[PDB]
Amino acid sequence: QFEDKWDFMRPIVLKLLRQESVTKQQWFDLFSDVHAVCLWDDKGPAKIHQALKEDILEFIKQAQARVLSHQDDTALLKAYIVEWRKFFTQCDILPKPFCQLEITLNVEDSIVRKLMLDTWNESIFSNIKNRLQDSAMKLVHAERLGEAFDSQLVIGVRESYVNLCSNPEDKLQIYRDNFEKAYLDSTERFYRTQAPSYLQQNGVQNYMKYADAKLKEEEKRALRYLETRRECNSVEALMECCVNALVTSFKETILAECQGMIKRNETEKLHLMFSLMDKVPNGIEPMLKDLEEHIISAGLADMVAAAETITTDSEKYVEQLLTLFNRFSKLVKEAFQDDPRFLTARDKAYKAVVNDKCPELLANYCDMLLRKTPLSKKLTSEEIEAKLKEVLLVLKYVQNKDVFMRYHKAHLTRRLILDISADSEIEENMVEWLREVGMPADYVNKLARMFQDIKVSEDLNQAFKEMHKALPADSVNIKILNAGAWSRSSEKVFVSLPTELEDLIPEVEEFYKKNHSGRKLHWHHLMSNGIITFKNEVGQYDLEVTTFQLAVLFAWNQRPREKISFENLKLATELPDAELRRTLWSLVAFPKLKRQVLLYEPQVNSPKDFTEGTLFSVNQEFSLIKNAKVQKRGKINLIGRLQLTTERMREEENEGIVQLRILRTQEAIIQIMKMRKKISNAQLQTELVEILKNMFLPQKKMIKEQIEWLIEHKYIRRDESDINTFIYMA
Amino acid sequence: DKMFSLKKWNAVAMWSWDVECDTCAICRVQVMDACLRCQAENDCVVVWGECNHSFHNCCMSLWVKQNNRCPLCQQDWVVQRIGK
Ligand SMILES: [Zn+2]
Ligand SMILES: [Zn+2]
Ligand SMILES: [Zn+2]
């Protein structure tokens, strides 16, 4: 029975419990006798645990004294650890001589081991415990103060907490519930005290740096003072606690810093913040907001202000938009570590910037860049393209893409009629560029067609340059264009031409008809221009003038000193007052000239100042002036704006767009209804918005009107039970 | 050797289909006047095809529903311009 075997076992058991030199023979004497106890004595398994409890307790009490006696908290832990190590060692050794006990009452689940761990707690680790913990925490505090005590003292304590609760059901019960708890009590307490002491005198960024540093140090302490054996998970929560207690609390001020850093593009300071506030469950999200706000505000501020100063300054419009894009793009790439959330905040905000709303201006601006303007003359062909390349972004954001393209195309048409592009390639680039934006092929293709048409027109031109030998063929360049596209309007300001031209046109028409049967010319003299040698008393100067001006000037070909009235010129040219006045004005008041082509009695400031009785004559003193000297020959342009885009044309294009929107909407409805035979207004409107999205945003009012039309014209019909539901008809 | 001796002329003109600026062809009212539907149930405006043929937008839209080709020739239809 137990009382027969235990007397031989105990001595050995004690040695196991005191970590003494248990011999192999003793290992087995005990082991064999352990089995005998459990087998022979029905209560053996219990008695052996009891005797063990007593033997264990004796050791534990010795250990307690060996630790407890040390009123010095650190000496205490040193002793604790020492005793602990011996204790733990036996915890893992004893179950071996006692396998038979553990099997009858698995050395891993060892009941004795449990009793040992429990006894340790009962006498030491759940009482001197108070000091074990206070000490460990004072030491953890020391590590935080800078008093980097030998980490092992706290680690040791933690190892004990963990091992004591090694029970597989909750291997971290004590550790987590008490050590991590205490850790946090000390962590938060320490830093809830120090984190403010820091900021109290330190700047926000200084604190933030300290804070993050503290967090890194805490990660190290977590690897040391806290457990690493397993995933732990709660250990992360502890880091979250550090953040919350310290950083999130402070976040209330850090976000103010965010806004400031954004305004100054202080990406490094904001970079730190990004990381720190990302850790803060409710920090980085407000930062997203701040970014969005600044970008939109910049639009409402920087973009809009620019637009007002810009008028025609395309470079600034373009660059300002793109400067903002890039300024903030950079910010996000650095300050916000290229994080998709900030990229999105930016994307949305900037989209607003772009739509904060007149693509028609952007179009005018692209024209300025593309064509040979004083603006474009300062740019290398590559720079012109580059600016546009960046503009791609703007247009992608622009909702009403059709607006931009309408105006752009209107400008292209003109550019190709007059050949006033910066160069040829920039035009080709622009077309491909629009494709790069992702713009509607309808417009982009038409632009491409404009170039193809010029090619065809020039084939014809060449024929005339070779055949007409009124003038020396070659001298004339005739562009016969596709009216359906090039005749942007029905504005055909017919003008009576010089004999040299009037006697040519019949041949142009003749030849044209002989090769273009079924076709009809539209003599768009308005866009026609040419060069005449201006014979003066002082010399011979070529003039680059409009066809209308040629007709005006024609009046004096054989009589330079005769006065011809405004009205007589009107008649000679068969012009309307509006155009006549404009062309005359240039002839008698073109900018930058020291000499005007025509002289006249009353003077004008602007075209409107001419009167029917205004007499004009040929400026026989006309000359290209150089260094204030009269040249014997030269060349002067008197066209300028006479052939350049007015509020009238701008509005005509505007309505044209509106009508296109209407037409496309109506067609889209039909297409949708063919696809889905019966759908709600919501479904219809949704699909319409999507289909037309790459051009513009459809308005429900317009859609409604198109629906009514389509109903009236039997393309669709309303559902008998729902006026919002439509059914394809016919 | 006249006062303004022609040296160069950059002539610009467009072309369209000849016959006469008459009727609409689908319908038949003057291309510049109201169309079968407006002038009767009273904005009938104009539309062009890449083929340079022009009709009232209202007449060519109705026709395109039977087949998407130009009434006069028979090439695939494509709006060139809606502007007047
Ligand atoms: Zn109509
Ligand atoms: Zn046709
Ligand atoms: Zn018609």
Author numbering:
A (entry chain C): 14 to 118, 129 to 379, 403 to 515, 520 to 780
B (entry chain R): 27 to 68, 72 to 113
Recite the paper's sentences.
The Cullin 5 (CUL5) Ring E3 ligase uses adaptors Elongins B and C (ELOB/C) to bind different SOCS-box-containing substrate receptors, determining the substrate specificity of the ligase. The 18-member ankyrin and SOCS box (ASB) family is the largest substrate receptor family. Here we report cryo-EM data for the substrate, creatine kinase (CKB) bound to ASB9-ELOB/C, and for full-length CUL5 bound to the RING protein, RBX2, which binds various E2s. ASB9 and CUL5 behave as rigid rods, connected through a hinge provided by ELOB/C transmitting long-range allosteric crosstalk from the substrate through CUL5 to the RBX2 flexible linker.
